[PDB]
């Protein structure tokens, strides 16, 4: 296709490795590029953690409003929300919101710890039929994004299929599904990534991720005004450890794959 060639050309120009999975829920068609190759998820992994917490909340009434203490020693880099709540503490819902909307790293760690560790997030992914996702480490260690390292990786297609199940399908109960969508729609960090490549009439809920090796990621659910939803994952990584983020690559990739409507 011209789409396959244009993505290959975007990839070559950018000096990295690009991974794309678009799922069109109108007809279930997929548009894939390196769709079955592993990429470091970085903070896009926060979506799976939040969904695991939401799932536990379906049967356990001491989850979403359970208050957790935030110790000064808990704080890691990129924690703009949790760093302001040392005295107040935060609920698991508030931590989930902070992780998703502000990419708060300490919030993610608290969620991982509450669930029982990184393996428990993998276990949640397994429970929804995602046999690819793996979470191995905590924040910020999981952002190393070393080429060839399988730690804290998934494939663009696996992540798209899972994001679909979680936001549009049957992985969560209606109340929880709706909550996750609301959180994603309120993301504060996604303006220059997938959303930048899409029409203004398409509503977006997304989660970005950034890591070492110039790793620049975004996953989105997309709601057109007059068409059925789309699910889009754009992953990008580079050969040099110190490479700068390239959000414009994700916007350009989103544009290529959605251009035909």
Curated annotation (Swiss-Prot):
Coiled coil: none annotated. One of its GO terms (biological process) is beta-lactam antibiotic catabolic process. Its EC number is 3.5.2.6. It catalyses: a beta-lactam + H2O = a substituted beta-amino acid. The active site is at 43 (acyl-ester intermediate). It comes from the Bacteria. Changing residue 248 to K: In strain: KH66. Substrate binds at residues 207-209. Pfam families: Beta-lactamase2. PANTHER family: BETA-LACTAMASE, BETA-LACTAMASE-TYPE TRANSPEPTIDASE FOLD CONTAINING PROTEIN. Hydrolyzes broad-spectrum beta-lactam antibiotics. Active against cephalosporins. This is Beta-lactamase OXY-1. The lineage of its organism: Bacteria, Pseudomonadati, Pseudomonadota, Gammaproteobacteria, Enterobacterales. The gene is bla.
């Amino acid at each position: 296709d011209a789409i396959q060639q244009k993505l290959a050309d975007l990839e070559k120009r950018s000096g990295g490795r690009l991974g794309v999975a678009l799922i069109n829920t109108a007809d279930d068609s997929q548009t894939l590029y390196r769709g079955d190759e592993r990429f470091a998820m970085c903070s896009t992994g926060k979506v799976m953690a939040a969904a695991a917490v939401l799932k536990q909340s379906e049967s356990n009434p001491e989850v979403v409003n359970k208050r957790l203490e935030i110790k000064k020693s808990d704080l890691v880099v990129w924690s703009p929300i949790t760093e302001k709540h040392l005295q107040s503490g935060m609920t698991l819902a508030e931590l989930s919101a902070a992780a998703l909307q502000y990419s708060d790293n300490t919030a993610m760690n608290k969620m991982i710890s509450y669930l029982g560790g990184p393996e428990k997030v993998t276990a949640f992914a397994q429970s929804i039929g995602d046999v690819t996702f793996r979470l191995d480490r905590t924040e910020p260690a999981l952002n190393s994004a070393i080429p060839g390292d399988k730690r804290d990786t998934t494939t663009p297609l696996a992540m798209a299929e899972s994001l679909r199940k979680l936001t549009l399908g049957n992985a969560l109960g209606e109340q929880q599904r709706a909550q996750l969508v609301t959180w994603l729609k309120g993301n504060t960090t996604g303006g220059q990534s997938i959303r930048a490549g899409l029409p203004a009439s398409w509503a977006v809920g997304d989660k970005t991720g950034a890591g070492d090796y110039g790793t620049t990621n975004d996953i989105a659910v997309i709601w057109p005004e007059n068409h059925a939803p789309l699910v889009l994952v754009t992953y990008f990584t580079q050969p040099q450890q110190d490479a700068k983020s390239r959000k414009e690559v994700l916007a350009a990739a989103a544009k290529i794959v959605t251009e035909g409507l």
